[PDB]
Every structure is written in structure tokens, then in C-alpha cells.
Amino acid sequence: QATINIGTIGHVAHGKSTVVKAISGVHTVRFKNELERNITIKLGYANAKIYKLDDPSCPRPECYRSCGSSTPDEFPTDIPGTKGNFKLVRHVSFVDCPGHDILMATMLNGAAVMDAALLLIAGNESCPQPQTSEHLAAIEIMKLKHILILQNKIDLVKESQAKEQYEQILAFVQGTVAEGAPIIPISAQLKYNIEVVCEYIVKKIPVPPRDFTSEPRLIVIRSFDVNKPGCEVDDLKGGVAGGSILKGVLKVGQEIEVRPGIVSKDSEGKLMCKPIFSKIVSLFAEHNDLQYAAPGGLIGVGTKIDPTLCRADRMVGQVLGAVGALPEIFTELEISYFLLRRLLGVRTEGDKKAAKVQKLSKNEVLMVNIGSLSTGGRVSAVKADLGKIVLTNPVCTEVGEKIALSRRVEKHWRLIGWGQIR
Amino acid sequence: CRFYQHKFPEVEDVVMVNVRSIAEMGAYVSLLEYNNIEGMILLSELSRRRIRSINKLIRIGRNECVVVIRVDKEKGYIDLSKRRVSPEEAIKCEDKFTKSKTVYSILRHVAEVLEYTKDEQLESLFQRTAWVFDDKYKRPGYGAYDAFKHAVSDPSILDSLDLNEDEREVLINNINRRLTPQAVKIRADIEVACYGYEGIDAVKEALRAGLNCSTETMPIKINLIAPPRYVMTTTTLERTEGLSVLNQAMAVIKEKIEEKRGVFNV
RNA sequence: AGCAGAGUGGCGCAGCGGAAGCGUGCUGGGCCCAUAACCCAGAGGUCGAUGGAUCGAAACCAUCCUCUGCUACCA
Fold first, then answer.
1. Total Cβ atoms within 10 A of residue B237
2. Is B239 left (phi over 0), alpha (psi -120 to 50) or beta?
3. Has residue A92 been placed in a domain?
4. Which of A287, A321, A355 is the last residue of a domain?
5. CATH class of B88-179
6. B192, B195, B197, B211: which to substitute to probe chain A, counting the most A Cβ within 10 Å?
7. Where does the S1 motif domain lie (chain B) (predicted)?
8. Residue B182 CB closer than 7 angstroms to strand C?
9. B177 φ, ψ (degrees, to nearest 5)
């Protein structure tokens, strides 16, 4: 299954497929083929098995040696050991977030259900690069600090440039946790020092305490239909949710409720929403059958919902509770909030436009990323430490946790501040 | 020979002429509508315009839609015009001619089961097949009977047609080869575009209901080609049988979905 | 992946059991002192593939082949 969710976030032009296939062995993929124009801009999924020969390096199935195929310029070979079967240490899960700035709201959502991260830095561009800081800050807000910085694209980048970049990032982030996070330079054109990464992810990132006894909550981020185009009438199936569970052991045959709900017909107001109920058909993770779905892992829960809800990606950031979950489904919400004194996620060589942003004005639409949900809503009352927001589609608030608040600076939204629900 | 009971055309009868060769005045063409009887086109009237062109890569084996001005049954000369044409429009005549040719081929054998082709005593053969059809009245009526016969299987060997030589061995599997049919296949597209979570269930229920109806009657089959999009494809040989299937399919969509409530487009 | 379209001369592209078309270039010659437009012949044909029912498949039938498109992605 899975034990931890390590995320693979990283700004434009570092190469995703080479690094993702080295760590998991499962390709990051989704629509267009044209696998991506540059680096993956979709929310990729992948799981993997991490075993040892009693060595800090992680074998392949063929554990005698491993000859890469990253480049035919030279032969990159590494040796994990010699063969006689290897001991399974754990089953790991990844969360490949978008690597592009416009997709920030999606990157936030996907990130918010991980248990650790890997900041994929690229040495090609600017030294205190916008997105590195954006990522790091969001991570410390959500409730994580289990980060391993990875210098992913320094294959042709000289050692002065690459040294200056790690220095400037680590010096800018002087108020964000990063001093207890290692910085592992690797090759992505010769897959070198990959074996030492395997030692790091088992060290810096154990399994955090998971609450089995507590009531099941599944947060769905990806939508999958298994009926698909060309289905037969008596080959009928349910609709499958790619979600991570962050609380409770969800068992097979259990009934689960999707709690933001669907709005009642001919509503004259903003209420009323009614949750949808679906019975769990199957609990699939990796490529191995399971009867349980332990928390701390990203699992494909097939449920008895019908094709229309899974025919496109429409279940992004929905909260699912088993069953008749107590969590309130607000339509208008009381945010406590604070703002950054800089504009996060933007800053170029001329140092534009990380200038301090003006105060929020009422009746402006802002993206409130609450939980893994992403709703848009307008601010109806605006006091400094008390704003009232009215949301277009209702938000199930599992706990008052955190929020991330963004404002439409130009073409798309950009992160301005965070806070906590009251 | 020819399918028609009469041996000659009449004034202002639209015919199709095979241009055999160009010589002097114009061309000594053969009317193919009535056997292979000789006629002629130009000298005075045929052209409608002059542009100093009439062929380039238009070779031979071709054919003109013409109308009969003067016909001489005794003398065997038929003065023809193409300039007269307006409701006698060439495309429609050509379409009619092709259909007539296949009908002629059916009526001129007929003939255990080689077929043969040719030749047999000629007046008798034509009289018992094609002349009798023309008699059985009139030309519209013959066309209708012929069409019914053509349809393979509507119903298969029947009408009367008590005729003659034996004659069912030929009717059974010469005629299908002779014609050929082609084909007819028609898609029927249905999109049921629900987006409640009750509506989807309603569509699914409707599809199941549809299957039950299909089994009950015996014909097709609806197939899901995308989550809201459904295709049945209906073949028709009796023509109007596809209408009956379409009506049933529509009714399932309209009544069954309604029960648990949904929306549809068809 | 399932699905709407296509299979023809270089290109455009008629056509359907008793026919490899026509448009455009192509090349020669003519008219004219000569070219041009024009005219004529010349030149360009697995009609995807695999067969079958058949007196005969350019035509019926089934499959395979491809691009053109769809819910927009299918653990």
C-alpha cells in the first residue's frame, strides 16, 4: 500500500520524468501525449516499493547491477549489491504536484495531503528563484518540515553557479525551516547519487503517528472512471476516487459520504447542500489487492458513484467522511487571516514584483484554498483580523486547521497570505 | 432488347444516348433507354452556349442525357435535342438510368442459376418478365413492384409473381448477386446528458430497460461509446423497419429516464 | 481506448456487378512571322490490406491499415 506521501514539487525546467522514474519506477502521466510540453503540469500519481539488501541503496528487481539509459553519451552504472532476495522495508507513495506557477492553486491542493516533500531545484535560472520560496513557505504553514532539498538539474551547470544558488535560497529562507533539511546534489542525466537519496528518505522521513482508531476521512484529489468509453452494459462498474486518507482505517464495504454536497434544486439562497452517499466497492493501492485502506497513504477507492462525476476531473479537493460525518458544510465562512509583507511566488532578476500588496477591498473574488478544497468566494466584510467570505460551492471544514489565501494580481491568482478558520 | 413493353420512344421522352463516335453533323448515337435504336444529335440544336470548348480529357465511353423531338418508328431515325432540357435534368435521368440498367439485368436472364446470358428465344423471355410488369399498371406501379422485389427480404420471394419457368432457384440467389444491394446502414445517435447523481442512475436504468425491450422484440442493441453518448446503428432492408426500432429506443429514453428523473437529447 | 470522416493517376477527385473517371499540371505539334490564351494527341492507375459468397469484386461482406475527431485521461 503506502506509509508516507513524499511530494515532488519543483519549478520549471528540471525534468520530471527522469527523477520520478528513478525514485518510484512509475511514470508521471495524464492527458496530452505530448507527455508534457516541458515538465508535468498535471497532478501525477505513483506508488513504489522500497527494499534493502541490508545496504542504504535501494535495489531494482534485478539487484546485481543497474545500467541506466538516461543518455548514450556515456554509460551510467551503479551497483546496489548482489542477489538472493531483498528485504521489504516499506511501501512508499508519491504526490507529483504541478511544476508551473499558474497552476499554484492546484499545487497547493495536492501538496496539502502529503507527509513530506522534495524540493526539485534547477540551476539554470535565477539563484533565489520565486517558486522555491513559495513552496517552502506553504509547507511550513500546512504542518510539515520533513523536507529534503534536491538539486535536480546541475548536469551542465558549473560548480560556482550551483553553489551560489544553494547559498542564496538557504539565506533568503532564513525564517523558514531548511537548516535541518539536507541538500543533495544529484545528476539527472547520469542518475548519480540516487543511492544516497534512498538513505536520506528513510532517515529524514519516518512514518509519522497515524490515528487508526479515529473516524475515516478520505480527501479526494483525482477523478478516475473505470467504466470509460466503450463500456458494456453488464460490465458496469463504480467511479474511482484517487484520494489520500489522513485519519482512520477505511475498511472495504464501508459506506462513505462526500460532504461538500450537491445543492438542492431551485435554491433562492446559498443553502441547502445535501451530501452524496456511495458504498465502497474496492480499495486498490499499488498493484496489489487489499481489504483495508490504512491512513497515511494514497489509495484508489472505487465507490458506487456513477460515470458523470468521474468523466472529467471534477472531484478535485472534495472531503469524504465515513458516514454521516460530523464536519460542518459552510457556505459562508469566518476567516481569521494574516498577510505576507511581500508578494510571494513572483520576483525576477530586476526584483519585480515582490513589493508589498495593498489591503483587500470588499466584493472582490479571491481563491480560498481551505483543506485540499479550492473554492472561489467574495469578501463581504473586511476587517483586518476578521473577514467574512461567501463561497460559490460549499466547503466541508474537517477542522479549523489552516487556509491559504490568494488574490488575482494579474492573469492568475498569486499567494498573498494564510490564516486559520474560526 | 429492352424492359419496356413498347419498342419505341415518343415525343418529348427523356432518354440516355451512348455517344459511339463523332462523325460529320454530330454523332450517330444509340438510345440505350429503348434497346440500341439509332438516333442523332446536333446539327441545328443541341448547344446552349459556345465557349470554344467541349472536351479536353473527356475521352470515350460517355453518354448524354437527351430528349426526343422527332421519332420515326418505320425509318429508324430519332432527332434528339439536349437544348430542350430543363426539368429533364441530366443527373436525375442518369440516376434513373443506372437503376433501370440493374432492373434490366435482373429481368433479362432468368435462368437457372449460372446465369445465362445469352441467348434464348427473345420475345417470349421478355414477355414473361418485363412486359408483364409494365402491363401491371402503369410504369409507377411496375417500379413499386420491382422495388419491393429488389429489397431481398421484403417479404422474400413473395408477391405474385406466380411466374414462370420454375423459378425460385434464380430468385433465391441469382438476384442478390445481380443487383448488388448496398447496404443501407444508418447510425442513430442519442446523447443523455444528466449531471445530477440521481440522473446518471436514471440513464443506466434506461439502458438496462432498453436491453430488455431489445431482447423481447429481437432487434438491436444500444452501445455506450462515451459515458453520456450512446450509439445504436440500424441496418434496413425493408426500409421502414429501422423506424420501428428508432421509435422503441426513443420511448425507453423518454419514459424510463423520466421515472427517476433526468434529461436527454435525441 | 471506444467513436464521426477518408481511402482513385502527382495533385484535385467521378464511380458502382457486366466501364479506371474527370480536373489540373505534364510533353509534342498545330493555328500565327512568333509567343500567349487555344486546340489535339502524347504522359500519369496495387481504386489501403486480407479474403469469402460469385459466371465476375473498382461494386457485397467481414476483418485489418491509416490520418482526420471525441469524454478530455480512463487506479
1. 14
2. left
3. yes
4. A321
5. mainly alpha
6. B197
7. 12-83
8. yes
9. -65, -40
